[PDB]
Design goal:
Elements lengths: L4 E4 L6 E2 L1 H13 L7 H7 L4 H7 L7 H12 L7 E2 L3 H7 L5 E5 L4 H8 L8 E5 L12 H9 L7 E5 L2 H10 L2 E5 L14 E3 L10
Parallel strand pairs: 1-4, 1-6, 4-5, 6-7, 7-8
Antiparallel strand pairs: 2-3
């Protein structure tokens, strides 16, 4: 017996977005008088925004403005973001019986502008963005909301991503986690998970 649903994170899993993130964050951070090293980019990329801005020492009163700037600049950089190789092939081969979806911390506007053009998005049964529930990963609510919308129980779902936040979301939700090893997150790699996928097409081995 295998899964009825696969839910995916976007950043570091479907899209190779760390380079664009790096450029955009550096640009925002300059307006707060701060540099942004490669080390800092690697460290903060997989974090929830609230954690990352805390880690970077942003004044807590400025968080909402910082995030607005980030979203504004990022909307000019989608062409700097490509899918990981194998992702398009993966979505051609996954069984049509699956309920596929997305659970992301991206705002809806960003999700739409950045993703809506990819043909594989037509296969998504549900997309949950930051705008669709009052809680954010690693709270389980966004994952559980997605699964309720496709009528699949937590035991019959796999959440595929490459962050500790995603891992904690899944654990909290009682949903199995599938590690996208190709995202190369150092911390996510050390957690015990249900499945580890070296490359995207390895997901097909579940079916």
């Amino acid at each position: 017996m295998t899964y009825q649903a696969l839910m995916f994170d976007i950043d570091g899993t479907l899209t190779n977005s760390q380079p664009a993130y790096t450029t955009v964050m550096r640009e925002v951070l300059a307006t707060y008088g701060k540099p942004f090293s490669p080390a800092q980019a690697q460290k903060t990329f997989p974090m929830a925004a609230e954690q990352a801005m805390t880690e970077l020492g942003i004044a807590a009163s400025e968080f909402d403005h910082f995030q607005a700037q980030y979203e504004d600049v990022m909307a000019s950089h989608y062409d700097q973001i490509e899918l990981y190789p194998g992702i398009t092939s993966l979505f051609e081969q996954l069984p049509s019986e699956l309920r596929l979806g997305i659970v992301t911390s991206q705002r809806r506007n960003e999700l739409e502008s950045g993703m809506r053009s990819y043909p594989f998005m037509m296969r998504m049964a549900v997309t949950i963005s930051a705008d669709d529930t009052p809680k954010r990963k690693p709270d389980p609510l966004p994952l559980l909301t997605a699964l309720e919308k496709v009528n699949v129980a937590p035991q019959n779902a796999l959440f595929i991503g490459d962050s500790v936040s995603d891992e904690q979301t899944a654990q909290a939700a009682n949903v199995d986690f599938g590690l996208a090893v190709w995202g190369m997150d150092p911390n996510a790699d050390h957690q015990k998970v249900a499945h580890r996928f070296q490359k995207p097409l390895d997901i097909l081995e579940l079916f």
